[PDB]
């Protein structure tokens with residue numbers, strides 16, 4: 809079985825986006841996911857791209873079509889209109905998260921002034 813928690817959410821979210829930005833296969837996604845990395849304490853990683861792709865596909869946020877012009881053939885993932893709606897839900901939560909970080913930032917500056 810797979811990875812969960814915040815890292816889980818942050819991986820799915822990032823993968824969906826990277827797919828929205830350019831439809832692609834598992835292997836290439838990994839490269840763009842690597843150069844993603846982390847400004848986020850403790851997360852890393854990143855890892856099973858393939859299985860969260862299959863997961864986002866099963867859930868209908870992504871569709872698939874084989875590119876047979878290359879060898880070996882590569883299965884291309886593409887965002888669906890549902891996947892875009894799931895994305896707006898991630899977007900609103902990123903705005904939640906960002907507001908929460910800024911309330912801490914200020915709280916901290918106040919005790920550092922003190």
Ligand SMILES: [Ca+2]
Nearest residue numbers: 871872873874
């Ligand atoms: Ca298909």
